[PDB]
Amino acid sequence: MYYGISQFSEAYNKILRNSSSHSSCQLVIFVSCLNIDALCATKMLSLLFKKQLVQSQIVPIFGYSELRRHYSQLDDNINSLLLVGFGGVIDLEAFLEIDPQEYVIDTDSGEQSFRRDIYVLDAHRPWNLDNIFGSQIIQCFDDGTVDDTLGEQKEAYYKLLELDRKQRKKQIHEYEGVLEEYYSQGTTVVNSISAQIYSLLSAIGETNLSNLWLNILGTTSLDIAYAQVYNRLYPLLQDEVKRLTPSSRNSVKTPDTLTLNIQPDYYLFLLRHSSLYDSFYYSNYVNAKLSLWNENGKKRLHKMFARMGIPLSTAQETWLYMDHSIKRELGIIFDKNLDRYGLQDIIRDGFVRTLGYRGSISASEFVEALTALLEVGNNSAQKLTNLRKRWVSNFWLSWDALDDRKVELLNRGIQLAQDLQRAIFNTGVAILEKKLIKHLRIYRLCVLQDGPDLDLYRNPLTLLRLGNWLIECCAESEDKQLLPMVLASIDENTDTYLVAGLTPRYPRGLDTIHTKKPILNNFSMAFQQITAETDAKVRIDNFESSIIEIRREDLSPFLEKLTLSGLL
Amino acid sequence: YSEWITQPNVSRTIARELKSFLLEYTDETGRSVYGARIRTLGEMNSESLEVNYRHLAESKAILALFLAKCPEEMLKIFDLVAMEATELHYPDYARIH
């Protein structure tokens, strides 16, 4: 283990000593764009370093090639680097062409110091042993997993390091096998970066309501994919909310009151900024629970809305303008007629932020708006770079959306979220009508060849959102076994497909013995092994390893080779 | 005939009989048409229950004879019975209609 939770403050003080020189800017923050949790963590760190007046550089990175190019362009004066949301699984010193000897200064005296110290922060569990153990430049902020579950891995790695007859070779083989079985494991995430930096801040003691709100947003960002982690971390955020809230409850609403509350936050889509009927119609959970893509789904939706006794016009009215009667009896109405249709899990308790008279807002709606701003905020290797430029630019739009003075941007993000949900819903219903998903014994392939708004899915987050829709829909199909799906989208301008390796997940609210065991996305090593051989001009640069760009001509041979591959 | 219909016991008997006719009228294929009709009435909130005269004539004919002779009060009574049946299928339907 490198940096435990209890010793994060030591790293903070070391960084402060290294680069609290206002004459220059010797600290640079690298953040993976198209990642909400990384954005929230970077906002926390930016506010914190604004407090101590430490000049910092914030660079949003989309692909690994961009990271290496920037590091090559990176000046030598910068003695402190921060990686947010990436770098914890790959050989950075090999990736960035780094040896300890070039960066080491004042080597003497059992100690070592370096002219450039890089601190990574991501929660992907395949912690690179050469990066967590066999280096001093790379500094990782462990969340208690390496120090507790990688003891055998630590011993094997140190045995290999110290050893560079027959029984000696046998033990070397055993240690290497242990290391390898530790590897070849799907990339999974156990904690949220926002919670880790919030714990660090609490250790420093510079917390406030805004930082707690940022931590709530960052944790909520992982609810859709990693709901078990969200349930694990929910009590800590709840206790922090109870602690920080002033005792002057039920106070008269002033234009300056900023209140965080814990209240029923039902698992709908943009409830407070859309009609109840549309919230149900666009909720991924409800859609998966009744398979609304069929014509029977809309009829059954009307069936519920009739069964509760709510007029359809009232349900289709905007949330703010509904009658106060329904707006004050929604909870009881859900209590009466939710278990009937199996949608009892919709009822949930979450955190709601109210800023004076500006109206309330829930964390789920805010993170949906942020993701929408990330996605659609605005010969072959040139237009792709322009797409990277636009994707990175949308990161700053999503970042500035955090400011309470830019609520107009938040409204645009909400509209974009509604439109993106509509587009993903329509694409899913069209796919499930035409049955573009071809079931195999390895993975359920699905490639979009032509159709509407296909240019929207070249954005990685849009493809992930479509994957969330389809995986949620297929999760409620008990007949359909657990199996990953693969999505591709041809970019006509570049004549390339965007293959997105996905992973199955357990249905939300379905908690079992196997549910506690996470699903591991083994598309990483399969993709890399297939690409290393049989050169097909594949572009694997995303920090999310299960996303590649493939030539249109090479798409079919690549998929055939992947079927021949049993790695995943 | 209208004065006969105004009798309270007659009104309650006709109400129960119309309830049974709605819930149990079965055609050749065997499905109860009016139960699904109440289902659809609630789902689309039509507020109107299209009841065929032939169905009421074939089963419990004197009800159809009265309807063809004195519809004025049994319109109210059968409308109330339809509302109660909708309450059965769709609880608290009185909110919408």
From Swiss-Prot, chain A:
Organism: Saccharomyces cerevisiae (strain ATCC 204508 / S288c)
Gene Ontology MF, one: DNA replication origin binding
The UniProt record lists the keyword Nucleotide-binding: no
Name of the protein in question: Cell division control protein 45
Domain of life: Eukaryota
Subcellular location: Nucleus
Miscellaneous comment text of the record: Present with 1730 molecules/cell in log phase SD medium.
Similarity-based family: Belongs to the CDC45 family.
Disulphide bridges, residue numbers: none
Gene Ontology cellular component list: CMG complex; DNA replication preinitiation complex; nuclear replication fork; nucleus
Keyword terms: Cell cycle, DNA replication, Nucleus, Phosphoprotein
Function: Required for initiation of chromosomal DNA replication. Acts at the origin of replication. Also has a role in minichromosome maintenance.
Keyword DNA repair: no
Pfam families noted in UniProt: CDC45
Name of the gene this protein is made from: CDC45
InterPro entries: CDC45 (IPR003874)
GO biological process: DNA replication initiation; double-strand break repair via break-induced replication; mitotic DNA replication preinitiation complex assembly
Quaternary structure and partners: Assembles into a complex with MCM5/CDC46. Interacts with MCM10.
Curated annotation (Swiss-Prot), chain B:
Gene behind this protein: MCM2
Localization of this protein: Nucleus
Role of this protein: Acts as a component of the MCM2-7 complex (MCM complex) which is the putative replicative helicase essential for 'once per cell cycle' DNA replication initiation and elongation in eukaryotic cells. The active ATPase sites in the MCM2-7 ring are formed through the interaction surfaces of two neighboring subunits such that a critical structure of a conserved arginine finger motif is provided in trans relative to the ATP-binding site of the Walker A box of the adjacent subunit.
Other remarks in the entry: Present with 1690 molecules/cell in log phase SD medium. Early fractionation of eukaryotic MCM proteins yielded a variety of dimeric, trimeric and tetrameric complexes with unclear biological significance. Specifically a MCM467 subcomplex is shown to have in vitro helicase activity which is inhibited by the MCM2 subunit. The MCM2-7 hexamer is the proposed physiological active complex.
Name of this protein: DNA replication licensing factor MCM2
UniProt record similarity statement: Belongs to the MCM family.
Known partners and oligomeric status: Component of the MCM2-7 complex. The complex forms a toroidal hexameric ring with the proposed subunit order MCM2-MCM6-MCM4-MCM7-MCM3-MCM5; loaded onto DNA, forms a head-head double hexamer.
